[model samples]
Target: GAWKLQTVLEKVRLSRHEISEAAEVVNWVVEHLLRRLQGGESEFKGVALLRTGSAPNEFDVMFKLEVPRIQLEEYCNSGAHYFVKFKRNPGGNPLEQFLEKEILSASKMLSKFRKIIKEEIKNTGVTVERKRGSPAVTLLISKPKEISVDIILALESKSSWPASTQKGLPISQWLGAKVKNNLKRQPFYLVPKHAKEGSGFQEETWRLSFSHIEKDILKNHGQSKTCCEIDGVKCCRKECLKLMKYLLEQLKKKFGNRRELAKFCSYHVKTAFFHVCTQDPHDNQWHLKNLECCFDNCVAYFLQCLKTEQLANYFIPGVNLFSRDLIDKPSKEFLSKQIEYERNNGFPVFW
Candidate 1:
């Protein structure tokens, strides 16, 4: 059934007074912080008010300023002062109800943000570790004095994908989306393979494999440039077994041992599993491996290229490695188990 706008607006009015009060306090804080940072002695003064109701499901208000980097640095160097005001909407839906609807939608935006930040850091040759504490950027959310902003942060973290999974989402999603959207220019083809053929293969036990490849592979085949450029190729059993062994060997080299590679993969896979599938076991279809097939394929192909430095230039292209696809699937149960395993084994997930 369609939602009634009049009914929703009626509810919104009930919360209007509380919302307004919250907005007033937020404005005061913004002004106070600006004035304090700017070295002004005046009391808090309200700034321009910006509100949006276009989404109708959620409300947002933001203020912007053109402060110089010097001022920004001054606040950080001198220990910035800030205020928060919280309010409950009179006509808005209950907190739980609002969350049930808005959580996934908010996650989508977060996924994008994570991806962009990761990509920018990688492209600039800056490590994520470098930004930890030195002039680090902090997000400030203000609510009425009674409401705690910490709760929001906690809830956000709990509901969204874990940091590791989130780290890869942006890159995978962007790259996959770009390839899918540009299908006209770079067309994909289906290539099939069978484990056994003719009378020798048992019809009941036979296996089939499908591969999605870029059409340009045929045109550039055998040339120094385009030999193994197929997008997705399902190889024979012999090739598959060989590739798996090779991948395991590479993983051991890059990440220590089988256990270490499993831990890293488990953390990311579980985190993504939780975000997308939530508590539902049947929804495993949204598993990380399935959701980010493009990423998995890219990584596998890139690793193969890395084996021989001759094909290393392929890594120069900015593949979406961090944001959208990575964050969408948070494996809650898997993450919980991984966390427990790490704690029990005294192993660090990040390193």
Candidate 2:
């Protein structure tokens, strides 16, 4: 448990709040430009960079339009746009700087944004050039490269989680090892009480224990055996389902009363579902159903435990499964259809 701070951060980053926040910031800036153009402003202008507090350390999308510097400056000064930055009193506690340092250091969101932008430009038939000491990236467009756009995307990164929290290894690694070793055995059994009650304890504990139990069953059951014959499939699934149910119930009982845990669990469950789906090709409905029946209920039980709309919003979009490439296609029309479907019917919002 040790709180498994890393896992908690991952969940938070992938939560509906975070995803919606990023989308809002990115879309707003893009729409602002489109609105300006629609108002009769002709010719290519400049770039508008919308920053976010998330990972890879950059803006969600840098709008590199053929525009003027005046427009770019106006946009930057508009205060309507929000940039994620640390709030620190100049002469406040020195520890604040330490915390700020950690937050800033952890930021890779901008870098990720830059990579995404470069790729987007390539798809849009623009050549991008970057050099040292340049506040903007140079874009070469048109014949003879005479027409160009000087693009500068400005954004900020803010920490949503406390930097003082201890960071753990990746969830998959932790879970895999825990499964291999068997949770009823050594290290897992040694988890401190503080860790068990920690914010991320539910996810961390369950994943680690599930892995352990899974490995134990696999070792006892061979591949040649059917589900009925394989102790691994039958026995392990039964025990795992029991544990999953218990944890879920505990989450419901605690979160239903505390409210905070409900919010957290809601976000966690939604994110975990997507995370699992993206990583494996197994039948999700089957997996979910088994867990549901083995534990004596369905997603409704999990949903009842959640306190906020965050989890509902998160899972609603993931009803459909699509290949990553298809999801990444940049056709606005296609994307609009997908978005509309997700918004109206709550489908296709997975990782």
Candidate 3:
């Protein structure tokens, strides 16, 4: 092969220094916020913990408040939840001021949190910006180097996961039923990701994020426990995922804005990867030496998903990742054909 596998891997490889610095930046932001806010349930998660890639694209941290289910039941109506009439929380006991009305306004709290970060690190070279429709207040740290971080707002819940999310992982068969049960037992985060199908101020609709679960699953992604450990067989599972992510990133840039392929994000590729594993469901099939074969299989699965246009959400099966209405059908065809070209031509885009 003209394109050396090692060469392609080097492009995606993240350095040790980059990884440590990313962690330090996240830790500093979290520490600074806790001092200012005081008593708010905050957590550092998402890309912050995983450190998947060398370049620090975005780090996501969740700021949550422990809210009671009784108040939620009395005030809301969307399932056990509701989009009630509300305003900013009054008073200054942590996040109480952003709870004056019935519903705790995510936008209001996030707005305040965004400002506080600015004031705290005003002299520092870090710049803060608000990205509408996104759950986190994006922070761009400069001085040493410009790095992107997302500090998202969420509500911590110890309640049962929604029924739709039950069959989402389906990893019980692969990673023991006990492990699956343990994951389910952990608290799920309610991030402020608004639904696409909504009118003005759909703030009540907070998207569910099982980032913790996803992190753990990816870490222990073997049918057998010691699949990638000492004296154990290494697998191309991670390599396949990284390759798929890299390919999708390359294609996303190629699509630009006219056709609007922004909707075909990493989540779609990640979902496709999950499905590929579910179908195969074995460790040996994805051995380290089989990187090329495994990568091909992943690409084929991605193509199959595009052709059928039924990229279902891993957590909620009803939610299709590739919604025909939101993203044009013709655009889908364009990508399907473009990807086929790249695949057939030995991925000139990678080089």
The residue-by-residue lDDT of candidate 2 on 224-292, one tens digit each, is: 234435342342233323333334434345336443333232224433343332233232322423543
Better of 1 and 3 by lDDT: 3
Tell me the spans in candidate 1 whose CA falls farther than 4 Å from its real position: 1-5, 40-324, 328-351
Best-to-worst lDDT order: 3, 2, 1
RMSD of each: 25.3, 20.6, 4.8
**Cα distance off (Å), candidate 3, residue 312:** 1.5
Q: Which candidate has the highest lDDT of all? A: 3
**Each model's lDDT:** 0.26, 0.31, 0.69
TM-score versus the correct structure, for each prediction: 0.20, 0.21, 0.83
Off by over 4 Å in 3: 1-3, 14-22, 39-57, 70-102, 130-133, 195-198
Residue range 1-351, candidate 3, lDDT tens digits: 344555787787844458677777767766665565553333221112222213465666666655435123311223222332233334433445565455566667667666666665645667777564665778887756667877766666677776557677777667778987888898766666765566545665566667777778889899988889997899889888888888888888776755556667787888889888888778988888778888889999999888888887776675677778557788788888988998898888888
Q: Write the per-residue lDDT of candidate 1 for residues 215-328, one digit (tens) a residue.
A: 221122221222233653321222222222333333335546334233233222222322221122121222223323422333334333222211211111122222222222
Looking at model 3, the pairs that clash are 14-54, 77-82, 78-81, 78-82, 89-97, 89-98, 89-99, 89-100, 90-97
Q: What alpha-carbon RMSD in Å does predicted model 3 have with respect to the real structure? A: 4.8
